[PDB]
Design a protein around this ligand. Sequence first.
Ligand SMILES: O[C@@H]1[C@@H](O)[C@@H](O)OC[C@H]1O
Ligand SMILES: O[C@@H]1[C@@H](O)[C@H](O)OC[C@H]1O
Ligand SMILES: [Ca+2]
Length: 223
Amino acid sequence: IVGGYTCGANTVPYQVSLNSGYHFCGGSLINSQWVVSAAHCYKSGIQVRLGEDNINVVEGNEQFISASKSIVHPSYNSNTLNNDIMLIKLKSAASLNSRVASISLPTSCASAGTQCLISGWGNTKSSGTSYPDVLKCLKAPILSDSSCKSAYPGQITSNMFCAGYLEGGKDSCQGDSGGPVVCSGKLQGIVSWGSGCAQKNKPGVYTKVCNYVSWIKQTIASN
Ligand SMILES: O[C@@H]1[C@@H](O)[C@@H](O)OC[C@H]1O
Ligand SMILES: O[C@@H]1[C@@H](O)[C@H](O)OC[C@H]1O
Ligand SMILES: [Ca+2]
């Protein structure tokens, strides 16, 4: 997160860290045994880390649970990042409380102008590199589809939306990938891609979760 603020320990209780020896992506807890992330975060040997603030210090509210199964969307295209979403089943159910909790799936798509909360452990600079150890937060509006398509001609599909600031300075970034975009208490987006971080007229692009609710519910009911 570039241009954000320090969330505060366990104030974003659905935020997960995906770990393969080191943090490499975020994700979102959607019930006690399933996590949603970006398909471009896929790899084998994932441990899901719940209840994290400082990802380098054991502070006492962590649950570390191995993944048992990963399901990349059947139509994921790694060249265009269309359908950039995947599901991860935990080997055991997480213990849910006020500091570890699930986030609700949406019943409708959010409109341009809605304010959302984006969070993660990714890079905090737009020219340079500095990875924080504690979770960072950003409040950002969903942008109109015409501004989104004009920022990224020929690249935005119906499964994507833009959120952020056209003036730059505030954005998600590398290492935030897979993490949540939450708007009015519902998971509306997944940190997916962008050109650089926090560049003028290059807002962040997010997977539009509302298009995937039927696939998620069906997949979970059968696996
Ligand atoms: O983001 C672009 C993607 O949509 C595709 O076209 O490959 C080239 C990239 O620049
Ligand atoms: O859901 C809320 C979101 O819409 C807002 O942007 O940040 C605070 C959250 O509670
Ligand atoms: Ca920790």
